[model samples]
Target chain A: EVEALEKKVEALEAKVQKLEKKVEALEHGWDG
Target chain B: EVEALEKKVEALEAKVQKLEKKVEALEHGWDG
Candidate 1:
Protein backbone atom coordinates (compact mmCIF):
# COMPACT_ATOMS: atom_id res chain seq x y z
CA GLU A 1 0.00 0.00 0.00
CA VAL A 2 2.85 2.40 0.71
CA GLU A 3 5.18 1.41 -2.11
CA ALA A 4 3.19 2.33 -5.21
CA LEU A 5 1.36 5.17 -3.50
CA GLU A 6 4.34 7.51 -3.55
CA LYS A 7 4.73 7.09 -7.28
CA LYS A 8 1.07 7.73 -7.76
CA VAL A 9 1.25 10.90 -5.72
CA GLU A 10 4.27 12.08 -7.73
CA ALA A 11 2.38 11.53 -10.94
CA LEU A 12 -0.59 13.40 -9.58
CA GLU A 13 1.67 16.25 -8.53
CA ALA A 14 3.13 16.48 -12.01
CA LYS A 15 -0.35 16.53 -13.48
CA VAL A 16 -1.33 19.31 -11.14
CA GLN A 17 1.69 21.36 -12.24
CA LYS A 18 0.72 20.92 -15.86
CA LEU A 19 -2.80 22.00 -15.10
CA GLU A 20 -1.49 25.05 -13.27
CA LYS A 21 0.55 26.08 -16.28
CA LYS A 22 -2.39 25.62 -18.57
CA VAL A 23 -4.48 27.76 -16.29
CA GLU A 24 -1.79 30.45 -16.27
CA ALA A 25 -1.76 30.45 -20.04
CA LEU A 26 -5.49 30.87 -20.15
CA GLU A 27 -5.23 33.67 -17.62
CA HIS A 28 -2.68 35.46 -19.78
CA GLY A 29 -5.05 35.26 -22.69
CA TRP A 30 -7.85 36.64 -20.59
CA ASP A 31 -5.63 39.47 -19.48
CA GLY A 32 -4.73 40.14 -23.07
CA GLU B 1 -9.20 28.36 -8.41
CA VAL B 2 -11.32 27.50 -5.44
CA GLU B 3 -8.38 26.29 -3.48
CA ALA B 4 -9.23 26.92 0.12
CA LEU B 5 -11.94 28.14 2.53
CA GLU B 6 -11.27 31.89 2.74
CA LYS B 7 -7.78 32.76 3.88
CA LYS B 8 -6.18 31.09 0.92
CA VAL B 9 -8.76 32.66 -1.30
CA GLU B 10 -7.82 36.07 -0.02
CA ALA B 11 -4.13 35.39 -0.53
CA LEU B 12 -4.70 34.12 -4.03
CA GLU B 13 -6.80 37.13 -4.82
CA ALA B 14 -4.02 39.39 -3.66
CA LYS B 15 -1.55 37.49 -5.79
CA VAL B 16 -3.81 37.89 -8.80
CA GLN B 17 -4.02 41.59 -8.18
CA LYS B 18 -0.23 41.81 -8.30
CA LEU B 19 -0.18 39.66 -11.41
CA GLU B 20 -2.63 42.03 -12.98
CA LYS B 21 -0.27 44.89 -12.29
CA LYS B 22 2.58 43.03 -13.96
CA VAL B 23 0.29 42.24 -16.84
CA GLU B 24 -0.68 45.84 -17.18
CA ALA B 25 2.98 46.78 -17.23
CA LEU B 26 3.69 44.31 -20.02
CA GLU B 27 0.63 45.41 -21.91
CA HIS B 28 1.68 48.99 -21.72
CA GLY B 29 5.12 47.88 -22.88
CA TRP B 30 3.61 46.26 -25.94
CA ASP B 31 1.34 49.19 -26.60
CA GLY B 32 4.17 51.64 -26.19
Candidate 2:
Protein backbone atom coordinates (compact mmCIF):
# COMPACT_ATOMS: atom_id res chain seq x y z
CA GLU A 1 0.00 0.00 0.00
CA VAL A 2 2.76 2.44 0.89
CA GLU A 3 4.69 1.64 -2.26
CA ALA A 4 1.65 2.21 -4.46
CA LEU A 5 1.03 5.56 -2.89
CA GLU A 6 4.67 6.52 -3.35
CA LYS A 7 4.48 5.63 -7.04
CA LYS A 8 1.43 7.76 -7.49
CA VAL A 9 3.14 10.71 -5.85
CA GLU A 10 6.10 10.31 -8.15
CA ALA A 11 3.86 10.15 -11.21
CA LEU A 12 2.02 13.26 -10.17
CA GLU A 13 5.26 15.13 -9.60
CA ALA A 14 6.44 14.21 -13.07
CA LYS A 15 3.20 15.42 -14.55
CA VAL A 16 3.53 18.68 -12.68
CA GLN A 17 6.99 19.20 -14.10
CA LYS A 18 5.75 18.59 -17.64
CA LEU A 19 2.88 20.96 -17.22
CA GLU A 20 5.15 23.62 -15.81
CA LYS A 21 7.30 23.44 -18.91
CA LYS A 22 4.27 23.64 -21.17
CA VAL A 23 3.03 26.71 -19.38
CA GLU A 24 6.42 28.36 -19.73
CA ALA A 25 6.45 27.64 -23.43
CA LEU A 26 3.00 29.05 -23.89
CA GLU A 27 3.86 32.18 -21.97
CA HIS A 28 6.94 32.68 -24.11
CA GLY A 29 4.87 32.32 -27.26
CA TRP A 30 2.36 34.77 -25.97
CA ASP A 31 5.03 37.33 -25.29
CA GLY A 32 6.62 36.79 -28.70
CA GLU B 1 -4.67 30.95 -31.80
CA VAL B 2 -3.30 32.82 -28.81
CA GLU B 3 -6.62 32.75 -26.97
CA ALA B 4 -6.93 28.96 -27.33
CA LEU B 5 -3.43 28.43 -26.07
CA GLU B 6 -4.10 30.74 -23.16
CA LYS B 7 -7.19 28.76 -22.24
CA LYS B 8 -5.27 25.49 -22.31
CA VAL B 9 -2.59 26.98 -20.10
CA GLU B 10 -5.19 28.10 -17.61
CA ALA B 11 -6.72 24.64 -17.52
CA LEU B 12 -3.34 23.03 -17.00
CA GLU B 13 -2.62 25.43 -14.16
CA ALA B 14 -5.84 24.36 -12.46
CA LYS B 15 -4.94 20.71 -12.88
CA VAL B 16 -1.54 21.40 -11.36
CA GLN B 17 -3.13 22.99 -8.32
CA LYS B 18 -5.40 20.00 -7.77
CA LEU B 19 -2.55 17.56 -8.24
CA GLU B 20 -0.49 19.51 -5.73
CA LYS B 21 -3.24 19.19 -3.16
CA LYS B 22 -3.58 15.49 -3.78
CA VAL B 23 0.15 14.98 -3.43
CA GLU B 24 0.17 16.87 -0.17
CA ALA B 25 -2.68 14.74 1.17
CA LEU B 26 -0.93 11.55 0.19
CA GLU B 27 2.27 12.71 1.82
CA HIS B 28 0.45 13.49 5.02
CA GLY B 29 -1.25 10.13 4.99
CA TRP B 30 2.05 8.36 4.38
CA ASP B 31 3.58 10.18 7.32
CA GLY B 32 0.66 9.40 9.56
Candidate 3:
Protein backbone atom coordinates (compact mmCIF):
# COMPACT_ATOMS: atom_id res chain seq x y z
CA GLU A 1 0.00 0.00 0.00
CA VAL A 2 2.82 2.38 0.72
CA GLU A 3 4.38 1.64 -2.63
CA ALA A 4 1.09 2.29 -4.38
CA LEU A 5 0.76 5.60 -2.59
CA GLU A 6 4.28 6.51 -3.60
CA LYS A 7 3.48 5.77 -7.22
CA LYS A 8 0.41 7.97 -7.06
CA VAL A 9 2.41 10.81 -5.56
CA GLU A 10 5.08 10.42 -8.20
CA ALA A 11 2.46 10.58 -10.92
CA LEU A 12 1.07 13.77 -9.43
CA GLU A 13 4.54 15.23 -9.28
CA ALA A 14 5.14 14.50 -12.96
CA LYS A 15 1.89 16.20 -13.85
CA VAL A 16 2.87 19.17 -11.75
CA GLN A 17 6.17 19.36 -13.57
CA LYS A 18 4.38 19.45 -16.92
CA LEU A 19 2.16 22.24 -15.66
CA GLU A 20 5.15 24.18 -14.41
CA LYS A 21 6.83 23.93 -17.79
CA LYS A 22 3.72 25.16 -19.57
CA VAL A 23 3.35 28.05 -17.19
CA GLU A 24 7.01 28.97 -17.61
CA ALA A 25 6.64 28.85 -21.37
CA LEU A 26 3.57 31.06 -21.20
CA GLU A 27 5.39 33.57 -19.06
CA HIS A 28 8.34 33.66 -21.45
CA GLY A 29 6.18 33.52 -24.61
CA TRP A 30 8.49 30.89 -26.05
CA ASP A 31 5.96 29.03 -28.19
CA GLY A 32 8.47 28.77 -30.97
CA GLU B 1 1.22 45.90 -33.99
CA VAL B 2 -1.85 43.77 -34.65
CA GLU B 3 0.25 41.00 -36.19
CA ALA B 4 2.63 41.03 -33.24
CA LEU B 5 -0.28 40.80 -30.86
CA GLU B 6 -1.66 37.88 -32.82
CA LYS B 7 1.62 36.01 -32.48
CA LYS B 8 1.61 36.57 -28.78
CA VAL B 9 -1.94 35.34 -28.54
CA GLU B 10 -1.04 32.24 -30.54
CA ALA B 11 1.82 31.53 -28.18
CA LEU B 12 -0.55 31.85 -25.24
CA GLU B 13 -2.95 29.45 -26.90
CA ALA B 14 -0.22 26.85 -27.36
CA LYS B 15 0.79 27.18 -23.74
CA VAL B 16 -2.82 26.77 -22.75
CA GLN B 17 -2.98 23.55 -24.76
CA LYS B 18 0.00 22.19 -22.86
CA LEU B 19 -1.66 23.12 -19.59
CA GLU B 20 -4.83 21.36 -20.65
CA LYS B 21 -2.90 18.21 -21.51
CA LYS B 22 -1.13 18.25 -18.15
CA VAL B 23 -4.41 18.68 -16.31
CA GLU B 24 -5.90 15.77 -18.19
CA ALA B 25 -2.90 13.59 -17.43
CA LEU B 26 -3.09 14.47 -13.75
CA GLU B 27 -6.74 13.60 -13.67
CA HIS B 28 -6.02 10.27 -15.37
CA GLY B 29 -3.14 9.41 -13.01
CA TRP B 30 -1.34 7.40 -15.67
CA ASP B 31 2.22 8.12 -14.64
CA GLY B 32 3.15 4.49 -15.26
Candidate 4:
Protein backbone atom coordinates (compact mmCIF):
# COMPACT_ATOMS: atom_id res chain seq x y z
CA GLU A 1 0.00 0.00 0.00
CA VAL A 2 2.88 2.37 0.77
CA GLU A 3 4.46 1.64 -2.58
CA ALA A 4 1.17 2.24 -4.34
CA LEU A 5 0.85 5.61 -2.61
CA GLU A 6 4.38 6.57 -3.69
CA LYS A 7 3.60 5.72 -7.30
CA LYS A 8 0.43 7.74 -7.20
CA VAL A 9 2.31 10.73 -5.79
CA GLU A 10 4.98 10.45 -8.47
CA ALA A 11 2.36 10.36 -11.20
CA LEU A 12 0.61 13.40 -9.80
CA GLU A 13 3.88 15.28 -9.35
CA ALA A 14 4.55 15.07 -13.07
CA LYS A 15 1.01 16.23 -13.76
CA VAL A 16 1.66 19.42 -11.74
CA GLN A 17 4.47 20.53 -14.05
CA LYS A 18 1.99 20.94 -16.86
CA LEU A 19 -0.11 23.23 -14.66
CA GLU A 20 2.98 25.19 -13.65
CA LYS A 21 3.66 25.89 -17.30
CA LYS A 22 0.03 26.66 -17.90
CA VAL A 23 0.03 29.25 -15.10
CA GLU A 24 3.23 30.88 -16.30
CA ALA A 25 1.82 31.31 -19.77
CA LEU A 26 -1.42 32.60 -18.25
CA GLU A 27 0.24 35.45 -16.25
CA HIS A 28 2.21 36.32 -19.34
CA GLY A 29 -1.11 37.55 -20.76
CA TRP A 30 -4.89 37.28 -20.39
CA ASP A 31 -8.18 38.77 -21.61
CA GLY A 32 -11.31 39.55 -19.60
CA GLU B 1 3.32 20.55 15.78
CA VAL B 2 0.28 18.91 14.25
CA GLU B 3 -1.85 21.93 14.99
CA ALA B 4 0.68 24.23 13.35
CA LEU B 5 0.77 22.06 10.26
CA GLU B 6 -2.99 22.03 10.05
CA LYS B 7 -3.10 25.79 10.16
CA LYS B 8 -0.48 26.02 7.46
CA VAL B 9 -2.44 23.63 5.29
CA GLU B 10 -5.61 25.58 5.87
CA ALA B 11 -3.89 28.77 4.85
CA LEU B 12 -2.64 27.17 1.66
CA GLU B 13 -6.01 25.63 0.93
CA ALA B 14 -7.63 29.07 0.88
CA LYS B 15 -4.81 30.28 -1.36
CA VAL B 16 -5.72 27.51 -3.81
CA GLN B 17 -9.32 28.69 -4.15
CA LYS B 18 -8.10 31.91 -5.71
CA LEU B 19 -6.10 29.93 -8.23
CA GLU B 20 -9.06 27.70 -8.99
CA LYS B 21 -11.18 30.71 -9.90
CA LYS B 22 -8.23 32.12 -11.83
CA VAL B 23 -7.86 28.95 -13.93
CA GLU B 24 -11.60 28.63 -14.52
CA ALA B 25 -11.83 32.17 -15.87
CA LEU B 26 -8.61 31.67 -17.83
CA GLU B 27 -9.91 28.76 -19.96
CA HIS B 28 -13.22 30.52 -20.53
CA GLY B 29 -11.09 32.93 -22.54
CA TRP B 30 -7.35 33.44 -23.16
CA ASP B 31 -5.37 35.70 -25.46
CA GLY B 32 -2.90 32.93 -26.18
Highest TM-score among the candidates is held by which one? 4
Off by over 4 Å in 3: B1-32
lDDT, candidate 1, B1-32, per-residue tens: 22333454455456557556656766577444
Give all candidates' CA lDDT scores.
Answer: 0.56, 0.62, 0.63, 0.60
Give candidate 4 misplaced runs (Cα > 4 Å). A1-19, A27-32, B30-32
Model 4 / residue B26 / CA error / Å: 2.0
Question: How closely does chain A match the true chain A in each prediction, as TM-score?
Answer: 0.76, 0.77, 0.80, 0.70
Clashes of each: 0, 0, 0, 0
Give DockQ: model 2. Answer: 0.05
Output the number of the lDDT-best candidate: 3
What is the lDDT ranking, best to worst? 3, 2, 4, 1
lDDT of 2 at A19: 59
Model 1 C-alpha lDDT versus the unseen true structure: 0.56
Better of 1 and 4 by TM-score: 4
Ten contiguous residues minimizing lDDT sum, candidate 3 chain A: A1-10
Q: Which lDDT value does model 2 have at A9? A: 59
* TM-score evaluated only on chain B, model 4: 0.76
In Å, residue A15's CA in model 3 sits off its true spot by 0.1
| lDDT for residue B18 in candidate 1, whole number 0-100 | 59
- Cα RMSDs, all models: 10.3, 17.5, 17.4, 6.2
Question: Which candidate wins on DockQ?
Answer: 4
lDDT of 4 by residue, B1-32 (tens): 65565565556556665665677677677554
What is the docking quality class of candidate 3?
incorrect
lDDT for position A14 in model 3? 71
